[PDB]
């Protein structure tokens with residue numbers, strides 16, 4: 001590691017230390033011991049601690065603050081990643097390994113809000129990384145195009161309910177784009193956290209979205225992760241959604257080689273999406289419970305659930321419509337994941353009905 005980098009590090013580190021009110025895990029876990037113990041390290045791909053904690057430093061309002069420029073970054077900086085992974089995922093010790101992929105008894109999932117007086121839509125998604133391809137930061141424009149090609153081609157062979165068209169971002173009308181985003185279908189553009197993390201170079205080359213006409217099955221190409229296989233729909237039928245997602249992932253897993261770590265499961269760019277890479281969610285209304293986002297989030301936390309704004313993370317709720325999803329992703333099976341979201345949302349419903 002050269003001096004410059006080391007300078008910005010000592011600098012950044014000092015910055016964090018001076019943010020009396022910063023509540024990101026980065027701050028909470030980057031101690032001087034941890035710092036000095038790795039700051040000099042570098043990976044086979046010259047990825048350095050600056051390339052890991054940078055977004056955290058520049059975006060103090062971060063919750064997590066770090067990223068893995070590449071698989072190696074996960075062990076090379078273990079001293080840091082380790083406690084963070086453990087903190088975020090609700091306990092994942094050093095000796096702890098991640099359980100084998102397991103969808104579970106799809107038939108044990110239920111409709112979340114029968115009367116339909118709270119839940120607007122149910123989304124469930126996963127993330128995958130193409131073997132032989134590092135994460136965003138270490139990518140080359142030529143590589144974004146390569147990955148785009150492999151994915152779209154594979155997806156071209158999707159049949160039945162999963163059959164669809166791949167729409168590159170490059171050449172997409174602002175209108176079409178803005179709409180797809182407004183309908184919660186396509187990823188947002190210009191995320192500050194992803195930018196300072198250097199995960200948007202050569203944008204929008206290689207970026208895109210594949211989806212069945214119904215738009216109930218989609219696949220994000222080259223945003224935060226190489227792939228984001230999604231299944232969503234209006235209503236609260238988790239069963240259908242999950243079942244659809246499963247049919248999708250497995251099918252795709254049979255055609256593309258995905259990165260899977262024995263200790264972290266399927267690997268992702270952000271430490272928060274490792275393991276099952278699963279985030280089950282619903283856009284739900286809870287007038288009485290949400291009378292204050294504080295107590296609402298406090299409730300959510302008791303169920304290992306996370307509260308986001310209507311347009312995604314780092315947004316505000318639009319019309320008392322919040323994004324409640326399962327927080328933890330690593331350290332439990334796919335089934336346990338969708339399960340934490342299902343259980344939490346059923347009780348929250350009950351609690352809402354019992355509120356004055």
Ligand SMILES: Nc1ncnc2c1ncn2[C@@H]1O[C@H](COP(=O)(O)OP(=O)(O)O)[C@@H](O)[C@H]1O
Pocket residue numbers: 121122123125181183184185186187188232279281282283308309310311312313323
């Ligand atoms: N239950 C849901 N229904 C509709 N859209 C949702 C729902 N859950 C998540 N989303 C959408 O996912 C998109 C990306 O949001 P984000 O919070 O970054 O989640 P992720 O990257 O995990 O998919 C946003 O457009 C958000 O509104």
Ligand SMILES: [Mg+2]
Pocket residue numbers: 224312313
């Ligand atoms: Mg996101």
